[PDB]
Write a protein that binds this ligand. Structure first.
Ligand code: XIH
Ligand code: XIH
Ligand SMILES: *[C@@H]1O[C@H](CO)[C@@H](O[C@@H]2O[C@H](CO)[C@@H](O)[C@H](O)[C@H]2NC(C)=O)[C@H](O)[C@H]1NC(C)=O
Ligand SMILES: *[C@@H]1O[C@H](CO)[C@@H](O[C@@H]2O[C@H](CO)[C@@H](O)[C@H](O)[C@H]2NC(C)=O)[C@H](O)[C@H]1NC(C)=O
Ligand SMILES: *[C@@H]1O[C@H](CO)[C@@H](O[C@@H]2O[C@H](CO)[C@@H](O)[C@H](O)[C@H]2NC(C)=O)[C@H](O)[C@H]1NC(C)=O
Ligand code: NAG
Ligand code: NAG
Ligand code: NAG
Ligand code: NAG
Ligand code: NAG
Ligand code: NAG
Ligand code: NAG
Ligand code: NAG
Lengths: 728, 723
């Protein structure tokens, strides 16, 4: 034989039999990067001297979670006693090790339970947050300077975000920003005094006799939001005689008039910082540009340099207003905005000018600006072949916008259609990561001649292992609806036969700016279901999905739980009318927003779906957080949008669940989508006499990511789908 | 046609009761509200069905005063725990036929009670006691110390309500209403259980419910006892409450007040229990005239202890005093370990037993000048039967069974309700046939008339294939252990049936009896042809202390092993499919079901645990410590650690498990199933779950009740391969 008889099993997925190798590096200069044990690989010639041996901290006495080398390379920060908080936040102990002296600093140690630590961009200055206050060390072995004195647990946050800013605004815990040379330290201060608390039980180890009540300031749609203030402190004029003096930069008048957010901080030069503010009604944002005044020691934002971004069709930006990329003199910047036709492109702005000029055009979008030099701007887009699920690196000549070159398109067009990039400190070198459709590929390049210097990781060991496995394939394509293309992907079982009828699982996100149809290679639950169980797993980007323009993306504005829900149902009708789908066995499942859509679909009375699984779903928008929800829904008030808030709950559709088989799953310590939401679904299903299947995960959060819990839920979901589809 | 799930869920086939409230020695009330005579059976209407048409509120319950002059109307009923609730109250003048509108009982009243004679009234509001001499006059504030969740005057806290008094009230009027005795509970340092309450879909942020609840080994509430004279209440000076302190033998450590019983007008008896519940003391306290105080002579103390276990069935039994209050009868276990009636003299340590045998007195029912009446399981040596007996006080040898022979075939489980001076009594037969309610004259013990025969139901059941009950015993180690089986209709001995073991198995439980039930087991047997069995093993009650105390300090051992062995015996009976045996239980039954499934015996295919205890340190102090002692290194910590469901997680790989729990369960906290599920996830065991949002220990909402039973039926049918 020698024919492939093996499949990709559930155990393979759960035990990581088939492992994807990565190549993670960190640029130390414009020609040097670190890699792990710790080598400073010289990018240029390939010669790599060793930086730090793996044996150096064996006598440490603690397990080291992470490390951080100072920009000057004189010190290393050692992160241990890591305790996870939310998606980005955590607490840890830190020790500092002098690299030139070969020993641990024992004097003036960074305290236990530190919330965040950061080196300056140059030298070895240190900023850290402890007990909600900011501290600064000029030298690692010296006493730290206390910058703030107002830090209060759950009320006042200095240099760190609160729950909502962490999850929905900055996608980070830190709210500290060093100036390019480390002279100034800018920070946000959040105030949660009147923000209501979400409360839930945490059960802990079985030795805890009485459960704990976790309490977190968490604004639900329409509730009192946190307020924010912004400050800048000169670290070079710190004295141990007097308290440090932080200079406030106030929000523009058009923002102070109501509730607003700080949605972006970007340093332009040593003495110029740009701020973006956003109204609570997220259709209007203002960029301030503020210069430092030397005679005063203060900061001033000229109303002439003030820039406005707004939308008449929806909210501003994909999830927030995009960040500027300033020129060296800080007199201009490049920024992604939506053009006249609704497509996101790079606009070039003069600092003193209202009007910008677009440097890219077309019926495609710029994903992000990655680097800019004197001569070139580097950006990722989905232009190539008009595939919105594809990603490539481009280079545009600043003096001639007609001179655009694709740097990644043709490198290896068959295995590589989804690229990300990592540039050196001044874009002289870059690493490219290809994520699919073939096996991930990591390569190094010099930008001068754009030539490939070397293959970093080609995943040949995994290619060897797969050679014998009956792996699934992927079909990426579109369907025309109301004269508009809508993309879908299908994970197709091996030896796929168009004449046969397969059961179908619709895998759904479908939230605003979602994309579930792409060229990325994945080893996941869907791989197992196709490979081993012979199930087609499909996904569909309908109205509301991103990277295709505002016409598609803004279609669900103020109307969550409508078109995106309706387009998933229609997708299933399209797939079955392709001819290879058994439409007695069509299922749907999703996590989070996908959980919400799955539930709305199962409660729609369409009659298309036999069964479905919702994991940690939203059940009604008033339960979810203000920043995300109000972005798309506005306020749940009679004068705003209360009617639709009330018309788009899962609960009100409970009666219709008599037609389907339903599995409802939620972790009890979910701080993001509160257990409350599934608790209300179940209570509504019980109230109408609908039988369903449920599963709670004790102390699990939104990711249900514990090793044991992760394995349990996928095993449980697998049983459910196999029985729904009558698979032995 | 068969008895279906819907039949059970929608109570298609209803059992009639006959509920009466005695008013005198020959007059009682029955529901219109009629005043039936125990002589002639005639009745003149007391309150017409539509007397309160123009009331404006929905009346939940009524209560006539002992003199019959005023009726108390209860509305705005809001349930709290098992017995506790809050309500609004109005008083109706029956003479004037109008509602009282001056000095009304406040909204959110916790407890109200008439005095035993006349029309005096005591109530509890915001944890304080108030007294109304006349319904229309202002009330006197008795206590000023009441405080939400902290100080309880005249009402119980969580643990006393659930585990000690089986009641919310802690008020005790003297026989003629002169004195009002009460208890004060102090929960200051008792730790709080906290859990989420999700409420209506309209609630944006869940509520955190916080209840003082002592888990095993935690700080317990403290108790004080007071008596106040209601005849000398003044609206000028504050009321003076006389404290009666617990005896010196109780004050030495943590203790409980476990019984309050008035002997006469000026004599009260109180029983106290140590936190280590194998030692209790009864105090007899007399009102002193020249001092206005209460004295409890140390010589009048009566100790009740146990060397093999705890004291009483769940608590020390209540005394029944002779009219002069110089003697009393109470149930205690004899030297052989069987519970019998002992006769005590107030001034003497030694009692004499008036009953003997290898069977038990269940309760003393009435005491007269010439006869003591009691209920027991003596008839035919059947621990699961119940009959009423009369003992001649002048000759203990002269014992008459009043109920044994009235209808031996349909009636084997009686309860009774005697008139005020015991001249008449209602008999309540609960099985094995349809319930029967009859009235009797105790002067000659002749039957007056049938009150309710359930013929309406009998004619209904004629057309349905109904299951039968086998009640019998097996021998284990030369000891009889009783079991019952609900057998499918047209039961065939040659066929192999699936079997479901229905479990309680807690200390002093009894699941094998002569009671007729229409329940879930009825549908399973009638429609699904499943045998539903129950077994009373070691630890079970009403069979003496040798069996009941078998599990002392050793919860989760013998009672668990005996359910497994019982199923092994049912397998050897020949009509059981050994490939289709399942087990289920609620509460303690959930604990035992889980313990059995985690035993790795290989006997059971599948099971269901509803609101199970998972480990004893999570459950309340009074119940748990009674059997387990304290979870400390110097006491019983090792067995607490050994008797968890969690430690058996790995053995659940052999079985199919359904775990169900209500999220607002104040009794067995959701915590308990949360720890089970986590342990099963940690060893990679697949199982089924169901939470019930906002449901408590009963899971008793109309919709949730229907939902849980439907869900369980599908699970059992799937386990048994039933289409
Ligand atoms: C199915 N699904 C999502 O719904 C999803 C998601 N990443 C996000 N985020 C978008 C903004 C930034 C950060 N909040 C993460 N969402 C949005 C969401 C909507 C409703 C409830 C919960 C969540 C969440 N986490 N992913 C990866 C995903 O698969
Ligand atoms: C299966 N089963 C029981 O386990 C049970 C019960 N009645 C009681 N009580 C006995 C003491 C007084 C009062 N607490 C009610 N228990 C005891 C118990 C043990 C463990 C956990 C919860 C509970 C409860 N409630 N019943 C009727 C029953 O069926
Ligand atoms: C955080 O915000 C709260 C209000 O949201 C501030 O509290 C107010 O402060 C002033 C000045 O002390 C008081 O007079 C007001 O009564 C407070 N208002 C309310 C509604 O509480 C608080 O000052 C803020 N804290 C910081 C350090 O910014
Ligand atoms: C209920 O018990 C509490 C706790 O033991 C008593 O509170 C103590 O009272 C004394 C005297 O006032 C104080 O010195 C202590 O500091 C108190 N302790 C605590 C923890 O509060 C309280 O007095 C009792 N209440 C009643 C009505 O008896
Ligand atoms: C009866 O006792 C109560 C409680 O001790 C008295 O009420 C308190 O009286 C004191 C002064 O003696 C005040 O300082 C408190 O504020 C009162 N508490 C309240 C609001 O009840 C009551 O006055 C006593 N009656 C009399 C006059 O003997
Ligand atoms: C790497 O190569 C250079 C130039 O060929 C050589 O001189 C040197 O030894 C290496 N670099 C260092 C300093 O590690
Ligand atoms: C952190 O805690 C440990 C003891 O738990 C102690 O040895 C150490 O000194 C602490 N570190 C600092 C800097 O506070
Ligand atoms: C700095 O500020 C804090 C609080 O405002 C004050 O208590 C402290 O003494 C100040 N330090 C000095 C010495 O200026
Ligand atoms: C960093 O920038 C500040 C502000 O422009 C300047 O005064 C300072 O000299 C700079 N530091 C260095 C070392 O260049
Ligand atoms: C029963 O009827 C008699 C008359 O025969 C009457 O005197 C008596 O009051 C009635 N009993 C009641 C309480 O209805
Ligand atoms: C009880 O509450 C209702 C509604 O708030 C009120 O109208 C009524 O007067 C109250 N009754 C008493 C006796 O206070
Ligand atoms: C009730 O008993 C008390 C105390 O013995 C006595 O003073 C009173 O007379 C009795 N009540 C009546 C009038 O029967
Ligand atoms: C009560 O129980 C404890 C613990 O089992 C025991 O040491 C003690 O002897 C018992 N007391 C009696 C009265 O038997």
């Amino acid at each position: 034989h020698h024919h492939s008889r093996k499949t990709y099993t559930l155990t393979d997925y759960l035990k990581n039999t088939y492992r994807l190798k990565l190549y993670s590096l960190r640029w130390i200069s414009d020609h040097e990067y670190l890699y792990k044990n710790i080598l400073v690989f010289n990018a240029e010639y390939g010669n790599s001297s060793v930086f730090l041996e793996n044996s150096t901290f064996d006598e440490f006495g603690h397990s080291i979670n992470d490390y951080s080398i100072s920009p000057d390379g004189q010190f290393i920060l050692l992160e241990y006693n890591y305790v996870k908080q939310w998606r980005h936040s955590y607490t840890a102990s830190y020790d500092i090790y002098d690299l030139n002296k070969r020993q641990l600093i024992t004097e003036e140690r960074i305290p236990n339970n530190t919330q965040w630590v950061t080196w300056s961009p140059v030298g070895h200055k240190l900023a850290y947050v402890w007990n909600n206050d900011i501290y600064v060390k000029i030298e690692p072995n010296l006493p730290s300077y206390r910058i703030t004195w107002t830090g209060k647990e759950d009320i006042i946050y200095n240099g760190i975000t609160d729950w909502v800013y962490e999850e929905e605004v900055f996608s980070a815990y830190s709210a500290l920003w060093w100036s390019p040379n480390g002279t100034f330290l800018a920070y946000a201060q959040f105030n949660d005094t009147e923000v209501p608390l979400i409360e839930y039980s945490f059960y802990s180890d079985e030795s805890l006799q009485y459960p704990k009540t976790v309490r977190v300031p968490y604004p639900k749609a329409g509730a009192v939001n946190p307020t924010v203030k912004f400050f800048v402190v000169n670290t070079d004029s710190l004295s141990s005689v007097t308290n440090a003096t932080s200079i406030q930069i106030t929000a523009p008048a058009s923002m102070l008039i109501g509730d607003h957010y700080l949605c972006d901080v970007t340093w332009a030069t040593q003495e110029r910082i740009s701020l973006q503010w956003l109204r609570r009604i997220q259709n209007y944002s203002v960029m301030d540009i503020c210069d430092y005044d030397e005679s005063s020691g203060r900061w001033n934002c000229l109303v002439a340099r003030q820039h406005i971004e707004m939308s008449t069709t929806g909210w501003v930006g994909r999830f927030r207003p995009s960040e500027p990329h300033f020129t060296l003199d800080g007199n201009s910047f490049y920024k992604i905005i939506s053009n006249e036709e609704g497509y996101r492109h790079i606009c070039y702005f003069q600092i003193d000018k209202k009007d910008c000029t677009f440097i890219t055009k077309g019926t495609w979008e710029v994903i992000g600006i990655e680097a800019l030099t004197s001569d070139y701007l580097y950006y990722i887009s989905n232009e190539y072949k008009g595939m919105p699920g594809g990603r490539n690196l481009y280079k545009i000549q600043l003096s001639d916008y007609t001179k655009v070159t694709c740097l990644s398109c043709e490198l290896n067009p068959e295995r590589c259609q989804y690229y990300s990039v990592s540039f050196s400190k001044e874009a002289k070198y870059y690493q490219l990561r290809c994520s699919g459709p073939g096996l991930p590929l990591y390569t190094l390049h010099s930008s001068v001649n754009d030539k490939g210097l070397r293959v970093l990781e080609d995943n040949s060991a995994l290619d060897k292992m797969l050679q014998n496995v009956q792996m699934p394939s992927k079909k990426l394509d579109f369907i025309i609806l109301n004269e508009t293309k809508f993309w879908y992907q299908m994970i197709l079982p091996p030896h796929f036969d168009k004449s046969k009828k397969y059961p179908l699982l619709l895998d759904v996100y479908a939230g605003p700016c979602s994309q579930k149809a792409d060229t990325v290679f994945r080893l996941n639950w869907a791989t197992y279901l196709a490979s081993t169980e012979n199930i087609i797993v499909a996904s569909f980007d309908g109205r509301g999905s991103g990277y295709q323009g505002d016409k598609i993306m803004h279609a669900i504005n103020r109307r969550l739980g409508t078109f995106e829900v309706e387009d998933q149902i229609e997708a299933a009708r399209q797939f079955s009318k392709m001819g290879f789908v058994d439409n007695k066995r069509i299922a749907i499942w999703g996590w989070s927003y996908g959980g919400y859509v799955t539930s709305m679909v199962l409660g729609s009375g369409s009659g298309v779906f036999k069964c479905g699984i919702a994991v940690a779903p939203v059940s009604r928008w008033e339960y979810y957080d203000s920043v995300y929800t109000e972005r798309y829904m506005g306020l749940p008030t009679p004068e705003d949008n209360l009617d639709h808030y009330r018309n788009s709950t899962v609960m009100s559709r409970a009666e219709n669940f008599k037609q389907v088989e339903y599995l409802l799953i939620h972790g009890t310590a979910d701080d993001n989508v509160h257990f409350q939401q599934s608790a209300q679904i179940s209570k509504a299903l019980v109230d109408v006499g609908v039988d369903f299947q449920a599963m709670w995960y004790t102390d699990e959060d939104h990711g249900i990511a514990s090793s044991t819990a992760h394995q349990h839920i996928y095993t449980h979901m697998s049983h459910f789908i196999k029985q729904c589809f009558s698979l032995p």
